[PDB]
Every structure is written in structure tokens, then in C-alpha cells.
């Protein structure tokens, strides 16, 4: 009924704050992005440094894998995204269009498209093959903190400091739904559940919420952690027991029971804000990463 994650590896190498960590869909690799303008690749199971990828002119806020684990896309303060061939290290395309920092990015499941959110308050949809912007959505009235495709790529969910989560039809670009609670503090992260019928959202009032997309109501809420200043990622953990995982501004990784909403674990070891966590696709493994005063990445493993 409770997991028992324990520290297995610490991964040091970035020279500035880490911004994001992501496991490759094939489970072999961890990718990390940093304010040091670099992407680093690490072994998912042993934490062994693999390679560095560079090219952005300013630091990076997000990085994401293609479904086949062969490409990455990165989002940078230099106002661009870059698509990378991981094996060669080549920058395949630079995606230009945003007029301010690019903050978040994701491939669709088919990985022919990329979605991005920016401080310019727009969501953009890009063709992966050509690198051209297919659509610009006037999505929000403040910076866009997260963007995510659902399981079949038909929908996009975006979140923003304007307090809104919005759901977009990928094909038409139409706003299908705006989620509004009783109070609407800045929304700092959002993603669909694996089946696409729920939405997990972080807000800058120390609160994560699980919404029913179709009925448009909040069902579960998770608290006890600290989150008022940074856009901290959140995960569903579903390889063992059903958990919610998030970093926190008190330097800990928080794990909740998805159903009962109780904190089941708090992982100690980081020395600065934990900005990013990821859950391994098949194994009960968590990656965590911390900001400027720490700069390390940690791999934790559990029996359930």
C-alpha cells in the first residue's frame, strides 16, 4: 500500500540549474535540460553519463522525447525550439516563430507534430518533418506553462499563469473547453492521464488537482508540498501502485496515493528546489532534478 523509493544514483554534470528530466519511451535513457544551455543523456538504469548535446544560444526550460526514442525537442529562452537526432547529436531543425521564451514542449504520439507553449502567450503546432509552424493558437492571456497531447493526438491541453487550463482540437485549432474552478490561481503544469479522460494540474498555491475532462470538474486534490514560485512537473506513477509524484520547493520529492490523496513518501537528498520528476515507463524508477544551488539529478528505485 506504500512504495519504498530509495536513492540509487546521483548524476552530476550540469553547471547551472537543471530544468527538466524525461525518460525515453523505450526505457533505456534519461534526458536532462538545463539553464547551462545543454541537454545531457544518461543511462536510465545505471545513471551513467552518455553524451552532451548543444546548440541553443540561451538556456533550456524543457526537453521531450519522440515516441520512437530517436529524437528530442527542446524549448529555450532564445525563442526557438530545436529538434535533435539523439544518436548523431545533429540539430535537424530550428523551429522559429515564438516572440518570447519557449517554456514547454511535447511530441504527439505519432511524433509528426510538436506542440509548444511560450511567454508570448501562444501555443504553436509544428510539423516535425518540415519544421514549419502549422498553427498559432491565441491560447492564453499570460505565459503558457505546459502543453500536452492526449493518447491519440486528437487533443492538446495547455495551462497558463492566467489561471486557465484549455483543451484544443489538434486538427481545427478550436478551443473545446476551458476549466475553471472556484478560484483560479496561476496554473503551473498540466497533463492528460494515460487514458486521456483525466487532467492533472499544478497551481502556484501548493495544490495539485485531478480533473474529469468530459464533466469538467475537479475530483481529487493533493497537498502537503510547497509550490508557489516555480513550474514544477507532476507525474502519474502506474508501473506498481498508483501514485502521484511531484517535486517541491522544500527540496523534497512528494509521492501521494492517487486514490486516498495521502502522502505516502517524501524523498530526501536534494539541496535545492526539485523542479522536475519523471517516472520510468516499465520499472518502478523515479528521476528527480534540482535548481541552481544543487544542480544534480537523482535516480530512486522501489519495489512497488
Amino acid at each position: 500500500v506504500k512504495p519504498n523509493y530509495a536513492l540509487k544514483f546521483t548524476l552530476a554534470g550540469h553547471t547551472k540549474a537543471v530544468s527538466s528530466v524525461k525518460f525515453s519511451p523505450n526505457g533505456e535513457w534519461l534526458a536532462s535540460s538545463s539553464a547551462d544551455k545543454l541537454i545531457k543523456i544518461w543511462g536510465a538504469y545505471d545513471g551513467k553519463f552518455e553524451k552532451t548535446i548543444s546548440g541553443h544560444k540561451l538556456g533550456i526550460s524543457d526537453v521531450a522525447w519522440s515516441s520512437d526514442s530517436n529524437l528530442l525537442v527542446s524549448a529555450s529562452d532564445d525563442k526557438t525550439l530545436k529538434i535533435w537526432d539523439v544518436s548523431s547529436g545533429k540539430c535537424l531543425k530550428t523551429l522559429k516563430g515564438h516572440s518570447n521564451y519557449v517554456f514547454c514542449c511535447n511530441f504527439n504520439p505519432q511524433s509528426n507534430l510538436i506542440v509548444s507553449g511560450s511567454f508570448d502567450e501562444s501555443v504553436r503546432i509544428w510539423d516535425v518533418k518540415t519544421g514549419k509552424c502549422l498553427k498559432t493558437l491565441p491560447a492564453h492571456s499570460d505565459p503558457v506553462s505546459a502543453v500536452h497531447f492526449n493518447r491519440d493526438g486528437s487533443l492538446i491541453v495547455s495551462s497558463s499563469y492566467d489561471g486557465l487550463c484549455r483543451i484544443w482540437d489538434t486538427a481545427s485549432g478550436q478551443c473545446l473547453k476551458t476549466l475553471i474552478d472556484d478560484d483560479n490561481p496561476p496554473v503551473s503544469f498540466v497533463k492528460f492521464s494515460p487514458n486521456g479522460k483525466y487532467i492533472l494540474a499544478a497551481t502556484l498555491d501548493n495544490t495539485l488537482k485531478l480533473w474529469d475532462y468530459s464533466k469538467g470538474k475537479c475530483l481529487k486534490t493533493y497537498t502537503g508540498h510547497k509550490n508557489e514560485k516555480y513550474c514544477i512537473f507532476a507525474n502519474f506513477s502506474v508501473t506498481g501502485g498508483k501514485w502521484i509524484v511531484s517535486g517541491s520547493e522544500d527540496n523534497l520529492v512528494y509521492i501521494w496515493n492517487l486514490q486516498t490523496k495521502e502522502i505516502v513518501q517524501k524523498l530526501q537528498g536534494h539541496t535545492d528546489v526539485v523542479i522536475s520528476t519523471a517516472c520510468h515507463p516499465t520499472e518502478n524508477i523515479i528521476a528527480s532534478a534540482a535548481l541552481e544551488n544543487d544542480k544534480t539529478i537523482k535516480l530512486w528505485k522501489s519495489d512497488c
Binding site: S193, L219, L258
Partner: peptide
């Protein structure tokens, strides 16, 4: 009833 299936169904 209050349980949610986030993976299947």
C-alpha cells in the same frame, strides 16, 4: 465509486 481508473477503460 471515488476510485478513478487513469490507465484503462
Amino acid at each position: 465509486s471515488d476510485d478513478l481508473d487513469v490507465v484503462g477503460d
